[PDB]
Amino acid sequence: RCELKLIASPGSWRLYSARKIDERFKSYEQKIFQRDRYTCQFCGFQARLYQDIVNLDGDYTNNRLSNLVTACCFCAQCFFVESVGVGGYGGGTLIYLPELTQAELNSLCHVLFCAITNDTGYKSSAQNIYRSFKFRSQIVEEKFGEGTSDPAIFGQLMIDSGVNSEEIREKLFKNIRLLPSRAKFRKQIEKWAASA
Amino acid sequence: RCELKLIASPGSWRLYSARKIDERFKSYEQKIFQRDRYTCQFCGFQARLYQDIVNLDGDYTNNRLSNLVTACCFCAQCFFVESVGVGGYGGGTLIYLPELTQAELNSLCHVLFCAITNDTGYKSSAQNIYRSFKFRSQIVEEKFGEGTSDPAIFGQLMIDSGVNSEEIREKLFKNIRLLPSRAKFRKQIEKWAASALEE
Ligand SMILES: [Zn+2]
Ligand SMILES: [Zn+2]
C-alpha cells in the first residue's frame, strides 16, 4: 500500500471539498473506485460505500490518474488534520501510540468497530481497546499544550510553527496517531456491517 | 479491573497446576466463573470455554474466594513466566513494548487472532501487526543476553539471580510484555472464534 502522514495543508481542504461536490468529478470518481477495486490504498479497507479520494502530492489542481487513489474516511481525514471536526467533517482524537503506525491503526479500528456493532462477545475486548487508545489523548496534551489532543487545534499548531522539511516535521511529531472517533462514523460502520 | 503484572514465582505453577486437577476445586470452580460472569478480570475477555482461575497475591496456600479471580489463558500465563513452554503449558515470546500495558496487549491479541482465524478480509492487517510486536523480541535479548526472549530461559535466569521482592520485579520487567504465540494457542483460538457469532 501507499504511505500515511499527518498533513496540515493551509487551504487545501477547500479544493478537496469543492472537487467532491463538483459534478464533473462524480464520473471520474467512479473510475477511481474501480481501478483500485474499492480498496483503500493505505490500510486495505474494502467496501462498496462511503469511499473518498485524496491526492498523493497534496496539490488538488492536478488530476492525473497516477495521482488520485482510493482512501477510506479514516485515512482521508489524515490529509486534513486542521479540519477534522470543522462543520461536521471527519471526527477523531490525536493519541500517542508508538507501537502502531497510522495505517495499522485505522485497519485495526475497522475490525474493532465492526466487532462492536456486530456484537459477537468481542464487543467487550474491543471497547477495552478503543477507550484505552483514547486515553492517550492526555499524553498528547502533556507534551504540546492544553487541548492539543483535539485535531482542530493541533492542526493549527503544526501550521503556526512552520516546518518545511518532511524530516524534522517527522521526528518532531513522531509516534502521534489520529484515532478516528467511533461516534462521528456511526452511519458508515453499521452500513458496512449489513453490506457484507 | 485489576492489575496485571509479569511474575516469576519460584514454584507456584507446580501448585497452580496441582490444584487445577483436584476434584475439591472443580466443585466450586464454577462459582468463580459464575461470579465474574465468565470474564477475565484483567483484559475483559468474555468466553464460556477455556478460562483459568489464578490467585491474585501469588500465594497458593490462601484460597479464599475474594482472592481467586477469573483470567483468560493469555493473562494466566503471565503469572508463571518461568513455565511458559515448560510441560507444554501456554506459549509466547517476551518483547520490549514501550507504552502499552500487558492487559492491553492481551486483549489486543484476541482481536488479531479473531481476524486471523475468521479471515473476513483482515488477515494481512492482523498478521502484519502481530509480526510488528514479535519483532521487539530482539530488543529484550540486547539488554539481557542471548536467548532471553524465550520466557522459560529469561524466567529461570531471574530466579537463579535471587529476584524475590516485588519492587525489583517491577524494575527488571519494566516495559516488557509477554506476547502469546498464536501457534501455541490455535485450539482455544478457533474454539472462541467459532462460538462467538451473532444471533
Ligand atoms: Zn484506510
Ligand atoms: Zn485476560
Swiss-Prot record, chain A:
Positions that bind Zn(2+): 40, 43, 72, 75
Keywords: Cytoplasm, Metal-binding, Protein transport, Transport, Virulence, Zinc
Top-level taxon of origin: Bacteria
GO terms, molecular function: metal ion binding
Compartments reported by the entry: Cytoplasm
GO CC list: cytoplasm
A biological process from GO: protein transport
Quaternary assembly: The T4BSS is a complex nanomachine composed of several subcomplexes. This subunit is part of the Type IV Coupling Complex (T4CC), a subcomplex composed of the DotLMNYZ core and the IcmSW-LvgA adapter subunits, linked by the C-terminal tail of DotL. Six DotLMNYZ hetero-pentameric units may assemble into a hexameric nanomachine, forming an inner membrane channel for effectors to pass through. Interacts directly with DotL. Interacts with DotZ.
Role noted for this protein: Component of the Dot/Icm type IVB secretion system (T4BSS), which is used to inject bacterial effector proteins into eukaryotic host cells. Part of a subcomplex which recruits effector proteins and delivers them to the core transmembrane subcomplex.
Record-given protein name: Type 4 apparatus protein DotN
Species the sequence originates in: Legionella pneumophila subsp. pneumophila (strain Philadelphia 1 / ATCC 33152 / DSM 7513)
